[PDB]
C-alpha cells in the first residue's frame, strides 16, 4: 500500500488504515478528545 500522510490538518506523520487514516499519535489524542 502507498504511503499516506495523516488526515489531521498540519500533521506530517504517516497515517494508517487501522487508525482510519490518522497516525497512531493523533488517533490516540482523538480518543482523549
Amino acid at each position: 500500500p502507498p504511503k499516506q500522510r495523516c488526515r489531521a490538518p498540519a500533521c506530517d506523520h504517516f497515517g494508517n488504515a487501522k487508525c482510519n487514516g490518522y497516525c497512531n499519535e493523533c488517533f490516540q489524542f482523538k480518543q482523549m478528545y
Binding site: A10, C11, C26
Partner: protein, 76 residues
C-alpha cells in the same frame, strides 16, 4: 478580534483574541475551550509552527484568520 483554530477532528474553534495576544495565551484559551494541556499543543499558521512568546500580530494573523492545531505527546 476573532480567529479560528481547526483541530485534528476538523472541528473549528472560535477564539476572542487581541493582536497583542501571545501564542502561549492562545494555547491557554484552547485549554479552557477543549481541556487540552498547552504543552501538547502545536499551533500552525501558513505552514509555520508558532513560538509561544511571539504574538498573533508577529505572524501576520488577522481578523477571521484560521490556525491549525496539532497535538503531540511530551516525552521529555
Amino acid at each position: 478580534m476573532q480567529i479560528f483554530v481547526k483541530t485534528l477532528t476538523g472541528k473549528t474553534i472560535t477564539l476572542e483574541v487581541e493582536p497583542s495576544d501571545t501564542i502561549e495565551n492562545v494555547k491557554a484559551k484552547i485549554q479552557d475551550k477543549e481541556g487540552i494541556p498547552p504543552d501538547q499543543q502545536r499551533l500552525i499558521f501558513a505552514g509555520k509552527q508558532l513560538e509561544d512568546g511571539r504574538t498573533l500580530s508577529d505572524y501576520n494573523i488577522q481578523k477571521e484568520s484560521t490556525l491549525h492545531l496539532v497535538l503531540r505527546l511530551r516525552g521529555g
